[PDB]
Amino acid sequence: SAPVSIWSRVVQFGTGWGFWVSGHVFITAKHVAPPKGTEIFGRKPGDFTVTSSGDFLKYYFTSAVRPDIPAMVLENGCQEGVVASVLVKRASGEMLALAVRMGSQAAIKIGSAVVHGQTGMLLTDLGTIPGDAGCPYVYKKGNTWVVIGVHVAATRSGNTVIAATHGEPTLEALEFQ
């Protein structure tokens, strides 16, 4: 479904994967990233800036690292009900697009961390596995592909997954009633 060229944007990173949103912007799961202050893609700290929000991590490079790729829209999650695709790469280079119905956005507790993200329900042993964190969630919005977050967590059994998103909630901020 997703354009063939989009997969070259998914690369190994730390103990997981990350995604080039543009030639300048690389997103990943905080928990898989190399330690802060590590040289990456041949660039030293200072040649890039890093922002984190929950388990979402974004690197911005002043000079393009991948000039061969057009910029894509990065959204803070998407509307509940959107059928998105997790672009999972495995170490072998195998590419597995996993259909997922996006659920609600919330601040989700995973172990000792709190992740701002969006829940999802895998539509199909053939889901995500340890090592997949950082792979992007994308969908075709109208007539263009947009990225909404990165894979961070799943249940062992069952089809629940969590994508970390870049923002903290306003309209989507949960409050006791």
Author numbering: 0 to 123, 131 to 183
Paper passage:
X-ray crystallographic analysis of the NS6 protease from three different strains of human norovirus has revealed the protein to be a cysteine protease with a chymotrypsin-like fold, similar to that of the 3C proteases from picornaviruses. The NS6pro fold is composed of two β-barrel domains tightly packed against each other; the interface between these two domains forms the peptide-binding cleft at the centre of which is the protease active site, a catalytic triad consisting of cysteine, histidine and aspartic or glutamic acid. The amino acids on the N-terminal side of the cleaved peptide bond (the P1 position in the nomenclature of Schechter and Berger) are typically glutamine or glutamic acid, while the P1′ amino acids on the C-terminal side is usually glycine or alanine; the residues at the P2 and P4 positions tend to be large and hydrophobic in nature.
The protein crystallised by hanging drop vapour diffusion in 20% w/v PEG 3350, 0.2 M KSCN, 0.1 M Bis-Tris propane pH 7.5 to yield crystals that belong to space-group C2221 and have two molecules in the asymmetric unit. They diffracted X-rays to 1.6 Å resolution, producing an electron density map of extremely good quality for residues 1–123 and 132–183 in both molecules of the asymmetric unit. For chain A, the interaction is symmetric: it donates its C-terminus to a neighbouring A-chain that is related by crystallographic two-fold symmetry and binds the C-terminus received from this molecule. In contrast, chain B donates its C-terminus to a neighbouring B-chain but binds the C-terminus of a third molecule (also a B-chain).
